[PDB]
Design a protein around this ligand. Structure first.
Ligand SMILES: O=C(CCl)Nc1ccc(-c2nc3ccccn3c2Nc2ccccc2)cc1
Ligand SMILES: O=C(CCl)Nc1ccc(-c2nc3ccccn3c2Nc2ccccc2)cc1
Ligand SMILES: [Ca+2]
Ligand SMILES: [Ca+2]
Ligand SMILES: [Ca+2]
Ligand SMILES: [Ca+2]
Ligand SMILES: [Ca+2]
Ligand SMILES: [Ca+2]
Ligand SMILES: [Ca+2]
Ligand SMILES: [Ca+2]
Ligand SMILES: [Cl-]
Ligand SMILES: [Cl-]
Ligand SMILES: [Mg+2]
Ligand SMILES: [Mg+2]
Lengths: 5, 236, 236, 5
């Protein structure tokens, strides 16, 4: 999965 | 509210303790209580709120994905019929996740966003609104799926418009917003080209502004820039 | 019971799904429902029950220790007065932990232990009884502390007596019981010499019986033997 | 802390 903050 | 009798300052203190103890459900409940006191939140307090709910919903999302994968496998050719239990339990977790999202969106609507006038608060809250609609979109399969997606998009877009007008390109909130909206484009809106374009433009405009920053601000901004780069590497 | 309307087999199936999803609170609730159906538990089912509650209470214990350490530091000389919040929140976590322990002890008393006639089931349940009294003892500071400690000791001792009579020295339940009772001696009963003696004798008697085992049984037994060795290394 | 199972 891609990075989120 | 179960936290109605506790002092605002005590709720904030206990949220910090809950974070240290990795008790994120408690942390979220304390911060919900603090929000419901009706006063605006400071920077630090906004970040306590976001950390708490991010961790709670993050755990629910991870669980939902495990169960969804099992369910998908059960509906393949040659899979033995195991009854309604996988679907039921996936639905249980899904409903709890939707409940948490609705809780967060409710706090934002009543009344965090409407009282947030400074760019740093307003963008932060609109980013959260986009994020929690995005989490609803991840599990949506019904008549409202398009509307949920559009609600995420709309919140992100308002946040983006303010952030571009009011914040420097290295601002961490602006960067994190762009990171997440880029992921929205890739994972939710079936728009990988928009995702890649946004991540690249954001990275490059931030790179060009790093020279203005202190060492500490540089560290903060470059951490999020690396996440943009990581996504770009994943996607290209 | 909230699980009263769900089939026993469905509860067991969902406990396994909850384990895969790392949803240990759910796993424990499903297994409590299964126990309350009133039928005895198989080996596999007993281990689902223990895994679920071990993970729940393990998280509570870790949180309690964090908060207790903070509280202790607050009561040192030169520490600024921060009000009742640390104590209150430690107490909240403590009460929830005691509630989980009481729930498990309640299942054992009503009626798992009394129906368990085979050594493998009876020892397993008596070990659990010792463990959950041990967890109560970790947080006990009152008039009943000695009685709680003695309740742990008594359960462990009955389990030990059966295990020595009825199981080989490499049996994993027997080994795990001895490991944990040794820790009881060291950490709860202020008896480090008894802890060390028990761990050493258990290890050595198991070593001497490994020759009787299959490859798979050998693997199982040696894993727990290594834990005995690890504790001995910590303590000597 | 010591090991238990
Ligand atoms: O809100 C105020 C005032 N200030 C502020 C400033 C910075 C951050 C922040 N810095 C980092 C660095 C690495 C990963 C995540 N990071 C976040 N997390 C976040 C969360 C939301 C949006 C963007 C970044 C967070 C908050
Ligand atoms: O109960 C039946 C039937 N069978 C059975 C058999 C083995 C185990 C077991 N094997 C291991 C190996 C490494 C660490 C923990 N391990 C446990 N865990 C446990 C738990 C309690 C007591 C002893 C060991 C567990 C169960
Ligand atoms: Ca009130
Ligand atoms: Ca007040
Ligand atoms: Ca305002
Ligand atoms: Ca500005
Ligand atoms: Ca019933
Ligand atoms: Ca039935
Ligand atoms: Ca029986
Ligand atoms: Ca035997
Ligand atoms: Cl369910
Ligand atoms: Cl509290
Ligand atoms: Mg649903
Ligand atoms: Mg107490």
């Amino acid at each position: 999965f891609p990075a989120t903050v | 509210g179960a936290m109605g009798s506790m002092e605002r300052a005590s709720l904030i203190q206990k949220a910090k303790l809950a974070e240290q103890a990795e008790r994120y459900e408690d942390m979220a409940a304390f911060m919900k209580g603090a929000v419901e006191k009706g006063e605006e939140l400071s920077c630090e307090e906004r970040n306590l709120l976001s950390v708490a709910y991010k961790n709670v919903v993050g755990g629910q999302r991870a669980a939902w994905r495990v169960l969804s994968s099992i369910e998908q496998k059960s509906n393949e050719e040659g899979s033995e019929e195991k009854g309604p239990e996988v679907r039921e339990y996936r639905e249980k977790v899904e409903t709890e996740l939707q409940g948490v999202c609705d809780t967060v969106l409710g706090l934002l609507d009543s009344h965090l966003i409407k009282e947030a006038g400074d760019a740093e608060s307003r963008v932060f809250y609109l980013k959260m609104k986009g994020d929690y609609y995005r989490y609803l979109a991840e599990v949506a399969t019904g008549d409202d799926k398009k509307r949920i997606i559009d609600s995420a998009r709309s919140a992100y877009q308002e946040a983006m418009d303010i952030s571009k007008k009011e914040m420097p390109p290295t601002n961490p909130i602006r960067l994190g917003l762009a990171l997440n909206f880029s992921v929205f484009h890739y994972e939710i809106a079936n728009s990988p080209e928009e995702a890649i374009s946004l991540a690249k433009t954001t990275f490059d405009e931030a790179m060009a502004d790093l020279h203005t920053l202190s060492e500490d601000s540089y560290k903060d901004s470059t951490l999020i820039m690396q996440l943009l780069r990581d996504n770009l590497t994943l996607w290209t």
